[PDB]
Design a protein around this nucleic acid. Structure first.
Ligand SMILES: [Mg+2]
Ligand SMILES: [Mg+2]
Length: 754
DNA sequence: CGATCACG
DNA sequence: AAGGTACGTGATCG
């Protein structure tokens, strides 16, 4: 009746209850369902076996687990009818307890759909789609500033400012006197945290926007709330924000709301060497943002001087986080709806996992038994499966062309699907060029069928946009057709994704083989037009007209795409991505370009990370600037020769030689003792409370042996007594950072010293 | 070398 | 207050 924003489950008297969080004509509504039961499927060697199989037992929470009910069902598997048994369980946590007991059984051929989280199982099976309708959501951006000193335990320093922003403006809560109109002064860290809780409960936002709140703002708020003995009842059910382990990093959920962390979103959507809020804001809104570094914040807080500067930075962090959230949420909301899963989960997923959620829902709709995810063995074998070289030098006036909108059409016309591949007793088939894979034409494949529907749906949205005089629906429909384009263009890549259920190596190669015929046509037609192709990948190409005027290159390129699209049948489409003033290419997905506005765009080259020393990062940025901004590779080579000589002669300040690496576990848990851990053990031995989250700063000293034995804690480094390892900083830091870039110009590691 | 570890 | 724990690249260890 309203708009679904999330779904989860609660346990009551040992039984699961599904919770559906809704927004209905401006109001928060929570619907409960007690009737949905967890299940798996089992393919048996013979029907007789069910009598033995239904009697399988497990143990969970001290008590035994049973198969509640069994049901024989007819489904489709590998494009063939299949008879399997639906095995019902009492609680979803029963599934991981009993699934291997069922799989182990001598009469069970295989088990299926045994790793689908219960709340997602519910949404699929009940045919429920989140984010449908015109329902208007409310938003709040939240940020925090902490007092930090070098290499402190996560949460030792207090939170000193909390900022938030809305359409009503950006505000700061602090516990020191600062005279600014947007600053609220409270008495303590405890009262500042309680004020944020009060702001969230009163504003009752549907969406809480953060910039990396999954790993910084919420874990820190929770750590300080713990130390202070106070609760954070931010959930609409008064629950505290909940930390979820996603990879090695975290994910924070706020119940009844959408915690929208922009950090994974922006990282997926745009290409930047660093994802600082300042770099991101400038990239999206073309406006500069000032950074106030942690050491400046500590100095201002401790001295009590220059606090206005810190409060302005805190306020801007919230204000720009609000603006970025409003910019990036509409597309995440349309992707959620398209795949039929909540924004929380979708905003945190790869495109491959978006495809899998879309396929799982469509598989239920079409009574198609879903394949299983590969085991560790199969996953590694897929990674091991096997399926031009760029022009050297510095090129000017580079035009970029995108091929990606070609592949969905190839999958559909050739019926490329795992269920149509090398079918026995097939009457008509398509044979892939060179590779020779045969795709049955007798029935539309599961994937080609879905893709066709997706593409038809996009054409209908586009037709509705041309015929619409309402700018509000035109905006919404624009996000919708874009969301379809993103999902449709992810299928080619998905066929080759090693963790995919509907993984198909032969599908991916066949699509590559058929796609190549069009790529060779584009290449030939460009070359006859005077263009030189500098780089080609399955995704696109880069070309120039050697020694031509920039507007002439653009005009001819724009005319070229207009022409090719008129020659290519159907929905096969070439796209002019952009233009670059300069660029160079090293190998596949290793290149660097500069646009006409001076913005450097690189792929697979930059080392902007804390585990690389400043000297290596500084040298790399300088080499890229000499090449792209100055068009001078000889300047770049001289930069490297000068830096290495300076390292040899001990002319580089020790602060530019520090390496930072986080401690992620108790020190005794390490299998390999890397330099940061060798340093950490020595600190612990000295009485330092070494805990996970600590970031270890070290300098590699001159000497015999591996680097771990020669690493020193930065706080212990004495320039008089210690001598850094110049050979380590030259060969393991500086030269690796620049050798890949310079290789594009004919230099070897050996050519970059005197 | 393969295993282990960390970055964003 | 559930809920399977990404992914891909590169460096140093053992
Ligand atoms: Mg959830
Ligand atoms: Mg901040």
């Amino acid at each position: 009746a309203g708009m679904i924003i999330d779904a989860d489950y609660i346990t009551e008297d040992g039984k699961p209850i599904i919770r559906i969080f809704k927004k209905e004509k401006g109001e928060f509504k929570v619907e409960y369902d007690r009737t949905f039961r967890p299940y798996i499927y089992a393919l048996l060697k013979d029907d007789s076996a069910i009598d033995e199989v239904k009697k399988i037992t497990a143990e969970r929470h001290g008590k035994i687990v049973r198969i509640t009910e069994v049901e024989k069902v007819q489904k489709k598997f590998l494009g063939r009818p299949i008879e399997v048994w639906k095995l019902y369980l009492e609680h979803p946590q029963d599934v991981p307890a009993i699934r291997e007991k069922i799989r182990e059984h001598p009469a069970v051929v295989d088990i299926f759909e045994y790793d689908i989280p219960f709340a997602k199982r519910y949404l699929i099976d009940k045919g429920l789609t989140p984010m449908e309708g015109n329902e208007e959501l409310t938003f709040l951006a939240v940020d925090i500033e902490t007092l930090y000193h070098e290499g402190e335990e996560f949460g030792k320093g207090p939170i000193i400012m909390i900022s938030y922003a809305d359409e009503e403006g950006a505000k700061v809560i602090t516990w020191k006197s600062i005279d600014l109109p947007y600053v609220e002064v409270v008495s303590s860290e405890r009262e500042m945290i309680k004020r944020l809780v009060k702001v969230i409960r009163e504003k009752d936002p549907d969406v809480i926007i953060t910039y990396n709140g999954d790993n910084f703002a919420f874990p820190y708020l929770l750590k300080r709330a713990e130390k202070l003995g106070i609760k954070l009842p931010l959930g609409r059910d008064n629950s505290e924000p909940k930390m979820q382990r996603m990879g090695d990093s975290l994910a924070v959920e706020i119940k009844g709301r959408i915690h929208f962390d922009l950090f994974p979103v922006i990282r997926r959507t745009i290409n930047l060497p660093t994802y600082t809020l300042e770099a991101v804001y400038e990239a999206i809104f073309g406006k500069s943002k000032e950074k106030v570094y942690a050491h400046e914040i500590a100095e201002a807080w401790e001295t009590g001087k220059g606090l206005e500067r810190v409060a302005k930075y805190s306020m801007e962090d919230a204000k720009v986080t609000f603006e970025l959230g409003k910019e990036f949420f509409p597309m995440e909301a349309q992707l959620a709806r398209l795949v039929g899963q909540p924004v929380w989960d979708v905003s945190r997923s790869s495109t491959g996992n978006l495809v899998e959620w879309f396929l799982l829902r469509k598989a239920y709709e079409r009574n198609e038994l879903a394949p299983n995810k590969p085991d560790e063995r199969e996953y590694e074998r897929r990674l091991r499966e096997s399926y031009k070289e760029p022009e050297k030098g510095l090129w000017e006036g580079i035009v970029s062309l995108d091929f990606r909108s070609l592949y969905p059409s190839i999958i559909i016309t050739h019926n490329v699907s795992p269920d149509t591949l090398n079918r026995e007793n097939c009457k008509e088939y398509d044979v892939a060029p060179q590779v020779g894979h045969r795709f049955c034409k007798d029935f539309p494949g599961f994937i080609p069928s879905l893709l066709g529907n997706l593409l038809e749906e996009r054409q209908k949205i586009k037709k509705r946009m041309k015929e619409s005089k309402d700018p509000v629906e035109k905006k919404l429909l624009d996000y919708r057709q874009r969301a379809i384009k993103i999902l449709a263009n992810s299928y080619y890549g998905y066929y080759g994704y090693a963790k995919a259920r509907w993984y198909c190596k032969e599908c991916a190669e066949s699509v590559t083989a058929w796609g190549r015929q069009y790529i060779d046509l584009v290449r030939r037609e460009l070359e006859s037009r005077g263009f030189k192709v500098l780089y080609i990948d399955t995704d696109g190409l880069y070309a120039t007209i050697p020694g031509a005027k920039h507007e002439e290159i653009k005009e001819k390129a724009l005319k070229f795409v207009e022409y090719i699209n008129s020659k290519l049948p159907g929905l096969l489409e070439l796209e002019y991505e952009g233009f670059y003033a300069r660029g160079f290419f090293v190998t596949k997905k290793k290149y660097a370009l500069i646009d006409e506005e001076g913005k450097i765009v690189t792929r697979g080259l930059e080392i902007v990370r804390r585990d690389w020393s400043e000297i290596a990062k500084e040298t790399q940025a300088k080499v890229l600037e000499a090449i792209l901004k100055h068009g001078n590779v000889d300047e770049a080579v001289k930069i490297v020769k000068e830096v290495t000589e300076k390292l040899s002669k001990y002319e580089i300040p020790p602060e530019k030689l520090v390496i930072y690496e986080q401690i992620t576990r108790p020190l005794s848990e390490y299998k390999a003792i890397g330099p940061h851990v060798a340093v950490a053990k020595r600190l612990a031995a000295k009485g330092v409370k070494v805990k996970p989250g600590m970031v270890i700063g070290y300098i590699v000293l001159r000497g015999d042996g591996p680097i771990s034995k020669r690493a020193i804690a930065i706080e212990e480094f004495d320039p008089k007594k210690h001598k850094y390892d110049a050979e380590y900083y030259i060969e393991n830091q500086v030269l690796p950072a620049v050798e890949r870039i310079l290789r594009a110009f004919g230099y070897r590691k050996e050519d970059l010293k005197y």
